[PDB]
């Protein structure tokens, strides 16, 4: 199936407490593989996945140098935006960026992207054509003009179509035992009383990989997607994922409802009842 290489970067100022905090975290699909955090004793890009042990020392030295450079550039960026928005140096502000590329099962590029936000709101982003920019306000319009004069879209596109794609393929090859595996979900249902003669049924799906999954509750063959309650799929601390979905049914007819779990590790979807 398709795969992705993404970097989540953020810089947050803290007036009166020193320099802004800068963090960069990289992911191949939904698992962390590298990270840089400026609040560490001796800031360095570090491996977060076991298979990254396959890169030599030159990799770590080069990624670290680039990260330290980005740390300083974002520090300046925070100051620049105070000017664009006419804000004071006393408040804390945040810059966020998501960069990445996705390839199909054959390793060919499907899409690339780079989007920024300031204080939680869209700032500037590369359009799908990978050639033009879209700006959310007049400040971002200033950035757009600077980037157009500097030929930034061309540099970024070269990175997304080239470097990003080539290294994602390499990571998938080196960490194949981890990234291309399938761990089937293990499910079970819990029961909880409620007032007014009703009961809460909760369907759990555990220890699965990859993260994509679908949990539904059914009645008479219909899908109760309208009444269900659930949580976003979440990491369980060991590289696998977890999720749950519930519905409130009247006491006495619990046998009428069923939980269905769909996942690539399940040839035939699971069906459970309390």
């Amino acid at each position: 199936g398709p795969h992705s290489l993404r970097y989540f970067v953020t810089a947050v100022s803290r007036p009166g407490l020193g320099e802004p905090r800068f963090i960069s975290v990289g992911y191949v699909d939904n698992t962390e593989f590298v990270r840089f955090d400026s609040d560490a004793e001796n800031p360095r890009y570090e491996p977060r996945a076991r298979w990254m042990e396959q890169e030599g020392p030159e990799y770590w030295e080069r990624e670290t140098q680039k990260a330290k450079g980005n740390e300083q550039s974002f520090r300046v960026d925070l100051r620049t935006l105070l000017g664009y928005y006419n804000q004071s140096k006393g408040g804390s502000h945040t810059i966020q960026v998501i960069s990445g590329c996705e390839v199909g099962s054959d390793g060919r590029l499907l899409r690339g992207y780079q989007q920024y936000a300031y204080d939680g709101c869209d700032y500037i982003a590369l359009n799908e054509d990978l050639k033009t920019w879209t700006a959310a306000d007049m400040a971002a319009l200033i950035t757009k003009h600077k980037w157009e004069q500097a030929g930034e879209a061309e540099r970024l596109r070269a990175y997304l179509e080239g470097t990003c794609v080539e290294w994602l393929r390499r990571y998938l090859k080196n960490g194949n035992a981890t990234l291309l595996r399938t761990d089937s979900p293990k499910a079970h249902v819990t029961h909880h009383s409620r007032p007014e003669d009703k009961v809460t049924l909760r369907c759990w799906a555990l220890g699965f990989y990859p993260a994509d999954i679908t949990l539904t509750w059914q009645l008479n063959g219909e899908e109760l997607i309208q009444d269900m309650e659930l949580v976003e799929t979440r990491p369980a601390g060991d590289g696998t994922f977890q999720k749950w979905a519930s519905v409130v049914v009247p006491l006495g007819k619990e046998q009428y409802y069923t939980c269905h779990v769909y996942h690539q590790g399940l040839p035939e979807p699971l069906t459970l009842r309390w």
Binding site: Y7, G69, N70, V76, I95, V97, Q114, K146, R155, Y159
Partner: peptide, 8 residues
């Protein structure tokens, strides 16, 4: 591997 970002 990561990108070297451009100033705003």
């Amino acid at each position: 591997r990561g990108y070297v970002y451009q100033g705003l």
